[PDB]
Amino acid sequence: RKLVEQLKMEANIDRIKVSKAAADLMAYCEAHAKEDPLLTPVPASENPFR
Amino acid sequence: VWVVGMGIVMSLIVLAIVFGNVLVITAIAKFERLQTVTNYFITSLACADLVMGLAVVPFGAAHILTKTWTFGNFWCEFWTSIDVLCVTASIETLCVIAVDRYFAITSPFKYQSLLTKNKARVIILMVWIVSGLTSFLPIQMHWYRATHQEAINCYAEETCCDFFTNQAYAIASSIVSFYVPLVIMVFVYSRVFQEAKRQLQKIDKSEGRFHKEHKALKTLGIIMGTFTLCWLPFFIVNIVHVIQDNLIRKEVYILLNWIGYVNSGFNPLIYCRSPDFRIAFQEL
Amino acid sequence: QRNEEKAQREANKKIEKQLQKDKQVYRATHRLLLLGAGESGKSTIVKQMRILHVGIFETKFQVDKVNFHMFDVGDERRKWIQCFNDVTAIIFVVASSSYNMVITNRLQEALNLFKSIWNNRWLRTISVILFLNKQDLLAEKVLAGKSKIEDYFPEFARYTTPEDATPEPGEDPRVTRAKYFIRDEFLRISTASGDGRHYCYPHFTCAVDTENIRRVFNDCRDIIQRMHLRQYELL
Amino acid sequence: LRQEAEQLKNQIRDARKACADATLSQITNNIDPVGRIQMRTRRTLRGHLAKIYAMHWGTDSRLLVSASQDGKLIIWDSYTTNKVHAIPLRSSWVMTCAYAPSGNYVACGGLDNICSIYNLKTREGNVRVSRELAGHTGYLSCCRFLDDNQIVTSSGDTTCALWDIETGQQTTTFTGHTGDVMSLSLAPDTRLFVSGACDASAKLWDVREGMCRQTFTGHESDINAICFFPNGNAFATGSDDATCRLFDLRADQELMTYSHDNIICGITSVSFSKSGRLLLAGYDDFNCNVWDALKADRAGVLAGHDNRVSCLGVTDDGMAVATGSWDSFLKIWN
């Protein structure tokens, strides 16, 4: 009764290609890779834990 | 040229004693998992054996090889004091470990409350102080020296290093060092063996149909046999040649003392068979 | 400036000193877990144990100046059981007088639950104390001839009383056979595995029995003693 | 109506397969690998008497809160390693903790089926319980704050609920899972959140509407952790069959799998990085591993713990990684 109506809502939704999503994630990672202390180690003069 | 080989074997003894004890020292301090109450006693024993191997044995080997003492009278007295100090302080730790195990097994509910870090440190300090009171004080104050002319000539000569004592000091040192801990250790381990046998009998009576004290026998026998066979023969002649002179030749005395020495190197093998110790050793 | 850091170190010392006092109480207490099927008598044992000596249900009591802490968690696929991997012992309560009731047989469900508990990844060290509750109901069932055990259990036909089977004082020979049949039926699973790390302690329990706390105390003492002996390789 | 339900299930898989132009690995094959990443412990916090089951950083990324099963809730200060508070607990079984975005309140929960809130910044300098929330019928598994007056909790009775701290009543409830709910994670804008259950499924709820939007499948066992990508359009899942998967909301299908043949232990926690390039996941084999989001190449192992790792967190500024374990020791890596 209630279960059969649930999949009806999720059946008709908008979907995009996998390639566009992959491009978006890779673009975000490439753009924000600069300000990541873990990827690029910070100088020891600006390390609070050292 | 037999002596030259006799040198070779001894050098291995010095290296083995130093090599065996250092692994025990580093593993306990480096790793926080191993820091327990009993490991403090084990560390104390390892340090005592380390001082043995570092200071006492090499000088004795040099004296044996060169047949002369070049350091002097003050240094030979200091060496004898260190020897007595390190021998006395190594036996008394075994009694402490035995009493600790007795308390742990016989009364398991009060074991956690009875012994903590503070009591362990106090006991270790007391043992070391009592050991120091027996070696340094009676030797440096010159209360042990003999009266016969040979001993007087030995003390007068600056190129001779021997050991002569009167009856009272020899008996007191032997009683304090070896005889007193022996009875305590025997009683403790007999009680522990009885408790283990009772537990095994109860287990057998519980579920015997669905499924004899050899493990306990072997485990107790290794320790008792090694300690006795190492330090018993020496502490008999030590009183034998003093009560009645001209019974035991010197070579026997030195041989028995050197046989008793190697218990310091044999101890870590017996007291570091825990799986955690093996894992730590494999890591290093 | 440095004035703030001076007061900050004071706060640490007060807290660090307090943790030392709380360590002594935590290290000198024993925790137990109550398990069993429904309608077995878990709370009945708790009520007798609580009264004499003093979400989730917990109980504090003291015997011979020893701190004891008992808690009951009261649904298949138990995910929370991984937390109780450091308790002293596990108390299992089973109604042995419920072999003829179906909800499959209740006794078979209890056996399945016990087998599942015994072979667990996290409970590979914790021992089990077993209570075979509701003895008088089983005695009454066996005394009258009806609903024989052989009807529900086929292995009862080829079972005989073991030689080392102490009978109850004045008990009829019929009830003892069934009692020990059930007891060994539970003990077989325990003895099938374990590798000597943990053992099982069986007991016979009723609703009016008062010596339960003595049994728990003795079994806990034996568990700790055996653990120490195994650790020292003296067993 | 059983046959009607299965008809719609086959339609979903038809549309999902049609949109799969190419795999993620093929597109990101030309990306230069990050290399080897090695970090060393900077601090070690001591003072917990038993195992540790929860941890949460602060917004300032200086103060963190930890929960233990000995009945304590200690607030540390990673910069100087000084305890600031220690709240006693009425129940000794605690499975979760949280820290307010404003820093004024701290939550707790566990097997007592009750959530508790403590008011840190109070007069007279004594922390006391501000509110107890009741209504669940199973042990709590996770809880997160939205603001000073709202909280979202997930329990073990296959439900999730949204509370109101001022009145202590359930504004709304979410249902649909067929198994115990194990974790959740809010969106960066706090408008959507996910939930990993024990039936090998994850959903995408809506806070304002209070009804499910999407359902993701693929795991072969229970789900133990979940976390959003920093963008907010993807999330990663961690199960106890030694696999991690990266899902996508817009593409509505699994994107990439992080598995190794030499690992057969479960996963207890996952977390991302500041830039969303590294995926750190704990393990039952006493250590932690560092993955690569776009390549599935391991790039370092953190093995400084003597027991299993039960929690893992990364500061907001992305400067340190805090881990907890069952040996009662926290560690800060940089």
Ligand SMILES: Nc1nc2c(ncn2[C@@H]2O[C@H](COP(=O)(O)OP(=O)(O)OP(=O)(O)O)[C@@H](O)[C@H]2O)c(=O)[nH]1
């Ligand atoms: N006649 C009799 N009744 C018993 C005995 N032991 C338990 N009971 C029954 O058990 C009832 C309460 O125990 P349970 O039904 O198991 O309920 P509980 O104690 O809360 O335990 P759980 O149902 O597992 O939660 C009592 O009302 C008794 O009637 C017994 O030895 N003799």
Ligand SMILES: CN[C@@H]1CCc2c(ccc(O)c2O)[C@H]1O
């Ligand atoms: C020369 N070496 C000494 C001689 C006497 C002696 C030793 C050890 C313990 C004692 O109680 C002693 O009396 C030996 O180590």
